[PDB]
């Protein structure tokens, strides 16, 4: 199927800063991946982004009542939907599960929400920042995230490694210890 | 770590000649819901979201008729200039660390592509499989490309290997991304 394609995308973007204290509304019109015309609540009217969108900015700016309602939409649309969704989006918290296994030592941190997280490696109580490689943050598409943080290390006998995770869902770090084989152990 | 900003996006599109169109809301990269045009039904991404909110699906159908009308006008205004295909990136991951015989899910994450038409197949030991598969709608990106997820439930094995096979008009060849235990 090599028939030519023609695509039209519309986006209404509600940008929130400091709760609903600061709210900006964008309406963006995009043909074949290129934005042609845009309403920005900072400007209060349509503006062409490319020459292809000039006709539309002119025509839509002439419809004054609808333009008034679009200037009000920071309240009637953006703030409204934020209030409806807050409890299950803004305030969603799902605790990470932490698994440590050799592959390298891998600290797999899964199932968590929101995305901001800190994962740290310790060796015998001391933080190790060298030989660390991370996937970064991966969005799973189902309102959870994962990340894998690898430590390249020469695991000796007697060594004890700890993966530590801080995340807004917990008030104290999650830790998982992994130990190499014991060589010799003694009474004292 | 606590988020300093949030973005809610209502993302719609119409595509010719396919006559495909979608309507969804996105919160910081996750789908809140979409309207299934054929069922005329609001589909919440997690079913519990619908305990807290409702959406009248008919409004999305009305919007998609405006989007189609405008697409027809833009197509001619551009002198029938077609979209440039941009092929996807693909990644395959499991949802959780794998444990033998414990139900898990393979995720095929398809990213950075346009137009929003893909053909995705799962293979097990080289053979197509479909039992229990699911997928998302086409999710938005800041560069106006798309994202999409496909999922395959499975029982992890030391012997079975899987591929996600992705076909798109911007690819010279179909792509495979494998996964094994």
């Amino acid at each position: 199927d090599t028939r030519p394609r023609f695509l039209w995308q519309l986006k209404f973007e509600c940008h929130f800063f400091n709760g609903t204290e600061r709210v900006r509304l964008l309406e963006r019109c995009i043909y074949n991946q290129e934005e042609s015309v845009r309403f920005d609540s900072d400007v209060g009217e349509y503006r062409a982004v490319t020459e292809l969108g000039r006709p539309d900015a002119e025509y839509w700016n002439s419809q004054k009542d609808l333009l008034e309602q679009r200037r009000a939409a920071v309240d009637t649309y953006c703030r409204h939907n934020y209030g409806v969704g807050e409890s299950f989006t803004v305030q969603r918290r799902v605790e990470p599960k932490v698994t440590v296994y050799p592959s390298l030592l891998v600290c797999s941190v899964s199932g968590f929400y929101p995305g901001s997280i800190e994962v740290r490696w310790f060796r015998n109580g001391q933080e190790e920042k060298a030989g660390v490689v991370s996937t970064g943050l991966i969005q799973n598409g189902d309102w959870t995230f994962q990340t894998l943080v690898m430590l390249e290390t020469v695991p000796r006998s007697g060594e004890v490694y700890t993966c530590q995770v801080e995340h807004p869902s917990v008030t104290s770090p999650l830790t998982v210890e992994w130990r190499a084989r014991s060589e010799s152990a003694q009474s004292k | 770590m606590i988020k300093e900003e949030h973005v809610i996006i209502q993302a719609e599109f119409y595509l010719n000649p396919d006559q495909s169109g979608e309507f969804m809301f996105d919160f910081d990269g996750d789908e809140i819901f979409h309207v299934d045009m054929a069922k005329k039904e609001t589909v919440w991404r997690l079913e519990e979201f619908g305990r807290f909110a409702s959406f009248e699906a008919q409004g999305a159908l009305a919007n998609i008729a405006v989007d189609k009308a405008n697409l027809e006008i833009m197509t001619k205004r551009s002198n029938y200039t077609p979209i440039t295909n941009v092929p996807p990136e693909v990644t395959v991951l499991t949802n959780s660390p794998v444990e033998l015989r414990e139900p898990n899910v393979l995720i095929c994450f398809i990213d950075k592509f346009t137009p929003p038409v893909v053909n995705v197949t799962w293979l097990r030991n080289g053979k197509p499989v479909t039992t229990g598969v699911s997928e998302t709608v086409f999710l938005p990106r800041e560069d106006h490309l798309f994202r999409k997820f496909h999922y395959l439930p499975f029982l992890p094995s030391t012997e079975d290997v899987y591929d996600c096979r992705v076909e798109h008009w911007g690819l010279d060849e179909p792509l495979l991304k494998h996964w094994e235990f």
Partner: peptide
């Protein structure tokens, strides 16, 4: 249960 709202795009000029 609270109602989620949508914004509606405008029709382009047809003539």
């Amino acid at each position: 249960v609270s109602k989620w709202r949508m914004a509606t795009p405008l029709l382009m000029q047809a003539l």
